[PDB]
């Protein structure tokens, strides 16, 4: 509600600030300029907040910060292509958004295969994604935490079909055959939004680009974020070797000075095909990639000197 | 076909130029890539294209050049929009804008009326337009022309009813008010492409769009065919004059030097105003804005001398 954030909100780049004690109420003002004052009971909206906040761990960057963070790039992407989205996928998506890192630990679905973590043996597959799912779910059945109790049995069973895919495409193992697939549909004109299973695509494609949108906020932000995310990656690399296992480059400690390098390769191979995929079907999301380009140079320049 | 059309067909201001016997083919070429080859049985779309021309008249404007510019201005906001639009949609629009002045006479509505025109009597409302889908349903009719028949019952039906509400909402006197609706349902974010009626209004504003679309080309091709609407409307007039009636300036040719102010009075007041509100809805088709505005200064320019 304050007047700076009531402006810069509605921008891609926004960043949601270090007042924790402010999030929930930046996130149900967002949901009630996205879906309407009448879409959700406030009483039990904030009640189910704080149960998706307690649920989110003291971890460097999959933490509550980032879902918060990860649901404002989906409301500026929902806020400028407003024609699009139903009343069901606007209410769904923020709340996938909000809960789509639910209780993670800060290891990736390898480390839970190789360390033989009970979930890797209950989900073979999008290991940590599914539990995500699983986790929201359990927060929903919780007494008073059913922000879709005003719904029919029909679309209740709609939007949680939209919050698990929508969760289940955060993994970006999923992304490279999705933004593929979607490319090939986009240049020979079969996409069609009124298609379902087309739809669903596009949704996982947004979907990554909210997950990965810290490389499309400004530099300062882009470069303090990358210290949480490599802090979980080389605690992780740290447990590989504790394994026995030479973990790759990306999560070791001793590889720091190959950083500017790693980065750069990212945004050339993941960040600026998502970015440039996704503005060829919504082109407001322009914005995005543009930001994405800035940050790209901004780690050129970092290796030159 | 050529190399040169194939590039600047793709352009919003795209003249097709003066030989008659290509338009049928330039009209395949935007179907064929708008729909896709297997959308129409080619014989079949060639024989229905051949005697909707011939049930289009020899008359200075709104002739078969006229439905054929009509379709082109379709065709490069289908494609710029590509993603948006059912199949049906991409079958029925490009033959709506086809046939929708199929068999005009060179008279408005009003003429009609006060001349007493069996038409007039048939039709109360919209009269000319419930006459061109009326034209487009018997073309239809004709053995070997229903370029609809491998569609299912319910789909023929609808694909009608598409056309029928894009032809009837040709006429401009259904513009204002279907323009003002959008305009605050834009406004208010209540506008949604996931609501038929919402919908409907949106097509009936791209037909609009469409049919004005001759103040959204160059300037010299904007001004050559002034002469040509122009051509008609004294007709009109002359008619008029005739059944004791006089006529309103517009269609005066006693008139004559007063024409700027009356292209500049409706740029301001029904061109600028539909394209903008369509560039709101379809941000892809500003380029149709763009080339109004450049031809409201050349109006402006012609004033000053
Ligand atoms: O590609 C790298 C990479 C590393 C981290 C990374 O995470 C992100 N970075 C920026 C924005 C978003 C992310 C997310 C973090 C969570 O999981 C998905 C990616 C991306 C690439 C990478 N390769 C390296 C080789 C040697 C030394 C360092 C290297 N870094
Ligand atoms: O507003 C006029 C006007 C006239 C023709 C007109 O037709 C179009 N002009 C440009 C693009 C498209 C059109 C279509 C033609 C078919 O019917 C819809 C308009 C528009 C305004 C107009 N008012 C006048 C007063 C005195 C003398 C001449 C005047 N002209
Ligand atoms: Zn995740
Ligand atoms: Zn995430
Ligand atoms: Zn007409
Ligand atoms: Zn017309």
């Given at each position: 509600l304050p007047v700076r954030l009531c402006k810069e909100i509605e921008l891609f780049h926004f960043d949601i600030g270090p007042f924790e004690n402010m999030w929930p109420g930046i996130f149900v003002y967002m949901v009630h300029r996205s879906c309407g004052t009448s879409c959700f009971e406030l009483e039990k909206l904030c009640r189910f907040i704080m149960s998706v906040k307690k649920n989110?761990?003291?971890?460097?960057?999959?933490?509550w910060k980032h879902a918060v963070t990860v649901a404002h790039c989906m409301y500026a992407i929902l806020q400028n292509n407003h024609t699009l989205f139903t009343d069901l996928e606007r209410k769904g998506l923020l709340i996938a958004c909000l809960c789509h890192d639910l209780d993670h630990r800060g290891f990736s679905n390898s480390y839970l295969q190789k360390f033989d973590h009970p979930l890797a043996a209950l989900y073979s597959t999008s290991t940590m994604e599914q539990h995500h799912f699983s986790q929201t779910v359990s927060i929903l059945q919780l007494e008073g935490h059913n922000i879709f109790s005003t719904l029919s049995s029909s679309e209740y069973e709609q939007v949680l079909e939209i919050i698990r895919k929508a969760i289940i495409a955060?993994?970006?193992?999923?992304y490279f055959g999705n933004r593929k697939q979607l490319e090939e549909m986009y240049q020979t004109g079969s996409l069609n939004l009124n298609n379902q299973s087309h739809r669903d695509r596009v949704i996982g494609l947004m979907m990554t680009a909210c997950d990965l949108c810290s490389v499309t906020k400004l530099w300062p932000v882009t470069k303090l974020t990358a210290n949480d995310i490599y802090a979980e990656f080389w605690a992780e690399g740290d447990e590989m070797k504790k394994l026995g296992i030479q973990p790759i480059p990306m999560m070791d400690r001793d590889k720091k000075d190959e950083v500017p390098q790693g980065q750069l390769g990212f945004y050339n191979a993941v960040a600026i095909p998502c970015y440039t995929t996704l503005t060829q079907i919504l082109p407001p999301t322009e914005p995005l990639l543009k930001a994405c380009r800035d940050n790209l140079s901004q780690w050129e320049k970092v290796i030159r000197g």
């Open positions: 989110y761990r003291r971890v460097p960057y999959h933490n955060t993994d970006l193992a999923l």
